Amino acid sequence: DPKIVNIGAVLSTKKHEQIFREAVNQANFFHFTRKIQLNATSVTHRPNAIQMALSVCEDLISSQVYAILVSHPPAPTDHLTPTPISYTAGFYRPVIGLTTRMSIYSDKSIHLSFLRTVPPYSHQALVWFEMMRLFNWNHVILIVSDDHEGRAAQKKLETLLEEKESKADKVLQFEPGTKNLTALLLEAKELEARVIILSASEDDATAVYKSAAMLDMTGAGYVWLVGEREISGSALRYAPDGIIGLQLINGKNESAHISDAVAVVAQAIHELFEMEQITDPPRGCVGNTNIWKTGPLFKRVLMSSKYPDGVTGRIEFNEDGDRKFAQYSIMNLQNRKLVQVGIFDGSYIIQNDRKIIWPGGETERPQGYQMSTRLKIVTIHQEPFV
Amino acid sequence: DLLIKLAREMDFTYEVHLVADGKFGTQERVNNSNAAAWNGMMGELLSG
């Protein structure tokens, strides 16, 4: 009889668990199984953190699982993030993300054995770099909030611009929760650079649209480059018609992430059980003090996975265990509607037959981003000189 | 007079401004609060 191996997963509704259990049954059929037998074991998101931890230690850890999946809590608000859940497997050394968009998971300190197959917001900044390849930009302004996402996006944008190419001017920071931000628009307007790149949440982007709207800063020459959290919800009616936006392909109902997830994990099990020691996880969280010796090795096998003929496209991990060859879609607000003007497959940006409309009523992007003839002169205070 | 000569030899607009104090490169040597500093002078050209 083949060895009964269990796989842990953290999903939301029952339909996703049905797709998971079906994906395990298909994984036991399309793959040659001669000594192992995959088992489907998934739970649901609990509104209580302690009940969730006891649910993992008495449902997932008690069944001796190797790989554990995670999605997102089905809640309209945000107050209890599943990040502490990733700490559970941290006690036993791997968690794979599916809908995690925050860049906080990109670090390896609190997320040692944590890998995700979804491009976060920082990768979107890479797409922004591709924008610098379209119209050949130079001086840009990055306006982010004062948190971990702004620091991660700042270090990412600074890492991308490490050669002798284009540089940064001034990065503006603000506390998430302050409406009076007129000084940011005054100092940003006084600067010669006009390329404004906003990357915040909804309540902050609304304050940027209101404060920037009551000062007449949406005319010609001003460029607004945002992501996905600035053209959804209440921050859509305040955005100017013609702002460059983004849209992730297949945002809701990602069955391909579950199927391809069970495919990659199944490949890592059928391929991992073909070397030799391969220890077993302990039984539950009772009377277990030792850690797992097969941690960085399992993460290494999960990271070294290639699927050029996958459902989502080309599954490939990088040095941090994130998702490569992302698939986005450059959108544009036209007449209070989001009209598709471009798509991003992974390598280059492909535009359709729709012309890009600028918020300042312009239709053609000039060569120079900003030019004038005003030169500021400063000097010291000396009697014979000045 | 040099600013007028360079202003008439080149087609542009100028605006002379007087600077007050703080002309030493900002040598952050005094223990402030054990934090991280940043270049705010030295060259003196990029304030705003």
Next chain:
Amino acid sequence: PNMDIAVILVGTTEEVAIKDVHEKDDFHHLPVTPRVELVTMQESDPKSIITRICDLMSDKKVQGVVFGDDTDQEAIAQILDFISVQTLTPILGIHGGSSMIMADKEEASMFFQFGPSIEQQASVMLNIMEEYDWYIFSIVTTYFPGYQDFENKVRSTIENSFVGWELEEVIHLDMSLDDIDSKIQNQLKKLQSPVILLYCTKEEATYIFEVAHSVGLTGYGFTWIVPSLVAGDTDTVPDEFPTGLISVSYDEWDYDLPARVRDGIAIITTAASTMLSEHNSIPQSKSSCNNIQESRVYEAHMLKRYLINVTFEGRDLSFSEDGYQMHPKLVIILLNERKWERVGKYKDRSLKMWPVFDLYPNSEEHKDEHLSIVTLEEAPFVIVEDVDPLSGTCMRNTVPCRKQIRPENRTEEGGNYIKRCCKGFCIDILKKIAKTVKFTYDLYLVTNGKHGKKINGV
């Protein structure tokens, strides 16, 4: 009021000789009266931790949770942070898995540990490299999370101080692939500095030292320096580690555990009493486990302002804004029978080098004994100047010259040692010939007897 302070102890150590503390009853001058409730735990698992914290919380209304173990698993400490997500209780780390640092934590959590951050360890390494006159250095860092602030801290520190440092290049090594394409050796073969820093982990340091054993960086003239998270436990001493590895770490020797618990209870009780003594208004105690939607509004962050500047017994035993101790008791150990032996104690800002000789190269062979030099404050030959109180250390080539005086208190003498800085022609010539012939010496003055003369007949 009697506030409950539970002390969780994890390990096989008998708690009978640990819970017996006599620093109570008489030491209750504050209006609030705390009480110690120490518990044991023989199973290291998150289920038992959450079980004892929730059951102990619902059973006894505690206020300050003091956790302490003796393992080497920092992830468990992160689990303690999870407890804050359900309690926001100031957790203090004294020893064990809660001893390691963790950069970029939660701004709403109250996790405070006694682990030295990279900024303090970097300053200690720069002080050690500064006292021994090590200007040229080579920094070796890997892909460990926390190297940007390290290289920017070293560069930003040497680009402002008056000491003339010399940075060759900070290289980077990869561990995901073995050194088979001749790249790591090519990056390590261009290091000609008398001191080389290392910033990585343990299994990576074994490979870096394994390749460096064949490249040629673990011998005479070169000296590697690792922080605290690289060496780890001092009991496990492998073979690839060469002789002479100056590493900084925690003392965990003379500092007794009951003193750590007493300091923790003093900090929790003091910080919990400053708000009552100043604001004169304190909320209620902690609620049960899942009952957080009702007690989530009673929590106040003002106590955080009382968790930065804390004084006790005169010493500056405070913390910082990141959540770590301001002045950690650090120790410097050197690897020789291949055993980590202590050589100096870095306190406040000064470094003490007493249980070891001041000269770094041993004399077991090369030269033997030493030489003492005594002179007198002469006009153009020996200029003696008092040490500046702003730093307390002679600068440049000013030789630190001590002075042995005796305070003549009426009919009783003493023994004061006042250290000053000497400089002049004699210092110049003796330093030029001393650097050429390469020997250790000393320098001091005369306080009684001056120049030799005849007395009666001697």
Next chain:
Amino acid sequence: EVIHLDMSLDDIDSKIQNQLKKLQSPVILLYCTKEEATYIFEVAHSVG
């Protein structure tokens, strides 16, 4: 400095390599035999 090398035992204590790593000159002379020159060039090929 004119260094001296002893050929009687395999370099396992890291001493000959430490004597050869301190050679910062555009021209290096060698005075030995053949089987010793193969080992000196063998280690020097790894030193740089």
